[PDB]
Amino acid sequence: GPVPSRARVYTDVNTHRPSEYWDYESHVVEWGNQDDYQLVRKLGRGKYSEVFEAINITNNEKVVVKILKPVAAAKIKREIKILENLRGGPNIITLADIVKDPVSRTPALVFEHVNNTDFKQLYQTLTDYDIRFYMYEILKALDYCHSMGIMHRDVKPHNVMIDHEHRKLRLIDWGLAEFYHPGQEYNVRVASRYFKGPELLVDYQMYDYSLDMWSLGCMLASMIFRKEPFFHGHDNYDQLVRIAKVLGTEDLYDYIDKYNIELDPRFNDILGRHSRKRWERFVHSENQHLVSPEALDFLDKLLRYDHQSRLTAREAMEHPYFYTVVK
Ligand SMILES: Nc1ncnc2c1ncn2[C@@H]1O[C@H](COP(=O)(O)OP(=O)(O)O)[C@@H](O)[C@H]1O
Numbered sequence: 001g002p003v004p005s006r007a008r009v010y011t012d013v014n015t016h017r018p019s020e021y022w023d024y025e026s027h028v029v030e031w032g033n034q035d036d037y038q039l040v041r042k043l044g045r046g047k048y049s050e051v052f053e054a055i056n057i058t059n060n061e062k063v064v065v066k067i068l069k070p071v072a073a074a075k076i077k078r079e080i081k082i083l084e085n086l087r088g089g090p091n092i093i094t095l096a097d098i099v100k101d102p103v104s105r106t107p108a109l110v111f112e113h114v115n116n117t118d119f120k121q122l123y124q125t126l127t128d129y130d131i132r133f134y135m136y137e138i139l140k141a142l143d144y145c146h147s148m149g150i151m152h153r154d155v156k157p158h159n160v161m162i163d164h165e166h167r168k169l170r171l172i173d174w175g176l177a178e179f180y181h182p183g184q185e186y187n188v189r190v191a192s193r194y195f196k197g198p199e200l201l202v203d204y205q206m207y208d209y210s211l212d213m214w215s216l217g218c219m220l221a222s223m224i225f226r227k228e229p230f231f232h233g234h235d236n237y238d239q240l241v242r243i244a245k246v247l248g249t250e251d252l253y254d255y256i257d258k259y260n261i262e263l264d265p266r267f268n269d270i271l272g273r274h275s276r277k278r279w280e281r282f283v284h285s286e287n288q289h290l291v292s293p294e295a296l297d298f299l300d301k302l303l304r305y306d307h308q309s310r311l312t313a314r315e316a317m318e319h320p321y322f323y324t325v326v327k
């Protein structure tokens with residue numbers, strides 16, 4: 001069957017922490033007072049929650065309330081424990097409270113409010129310097145959560161809030177996050193389609209923190225090349241074909257061979273044969289202001305089929321692409 005894999009960093013962080021840290025099912029939720037929060041307006045509804053802008057009447061501060069749906073109500077302890085474990089970490093959204101919503105009768109997570117800049121506005125206006133600055137800020141959040149034994153598993157632009165006015169970034173939406181345990185087989189139905197790593201698309205379950213580094217690479221490629229999204233698959237199968245049209249099929253087959261993976265036979269008629277394209281193929285007059293040899297080298301080291309071969313968040317922070325960023 002498939003060959004096992006383990007992370008090259010932070011491998012045993014959960015084995016050396018007390019059971020209380022990662023055993024989220026045994027966690028006893030401390031409930032706050034729902035009357036402290038007055039809902040103001042509905043910001044949206046996802047597959048798992050309804051999100052509202054609210055005011056904390058004990059200090060007149062704005063907050064965001066995520067009211068979980070019954071489907072979500074199952075693995076809520078996992079999101080709660082992860083949020084409490086990471087609380088206070090660099091660029092991690094702060095969970096302010098947990099209350100029982102009187103209408104849904106489900107848990108409602110109360111978060112710090114971010115006066116975030118519109119995501120299309122961010123995509124259209126961030127400069128070369130801004131992209132480097134903000135990529136460094138998201139790497140601080142990812143190295144922190146990885147060092148804490150957690151993988152986010154849903155890195156994408158909408159989960160990376162930026163308040164451009166205060167040069168403030170927060171990594172949000174920890175509902176798909178998981179504790180990393182060496183040898184554990186995880187569900188591959190994580191991350192949004194365009195950000196899914198090759199490990200998920202070929203059904204390799206023994207993945208790790210490096211999944212987040214693929215997703216970050218997808219964000220970087222879209223930003224510097226002005227192509228939203230960078231790998232535009234029509235479904236999860238075509239998603240792999242789009243990746244293979246850029247990275248080539250030979251390295252894909254080497255990756256499948258190394259981990260002894262049985263590729264779904266539905267790929268036999270759609271993958272074809274493709275060479276790796278040099279990153280300069282994607283450069284044009286409308287994106288040249290965001291591309292540099294350092295950006296291309298950094299991107300090249302994130303977007304690798306072999307999850308064990310990708311830069312870790314800490315190695316990424318050492319890259320020359322960030323030398324220009326004021327620290
Ligand atoms: N702390 C926050 N500050 C401001 N807006 C937020 C905050 N958290 C979520 N939002 C808003 O709510 C939505 C994202 O919610 P999210 O946690 O990603 O949902 P889900 O877990 O169902 O996928 C977006 O519309 C975003 O603008």
Ligand SMILES: N#CCc1n[nH]c2cc(Br)c(Br)cc12
Pocket residue numbers: 119120122123126130131132134135138156157158160161162219222223
């Ligand atoms: N793509 C896009 C816009 C956007 N949303 N969130 C982000 C976080 C970062 Br880090 C960067 Br760069 C760009 C964005």
Ligand SMILES: [Mg+2]
Pocket residue numbers: 158159172173
């Ligand atoms: Mg989200």
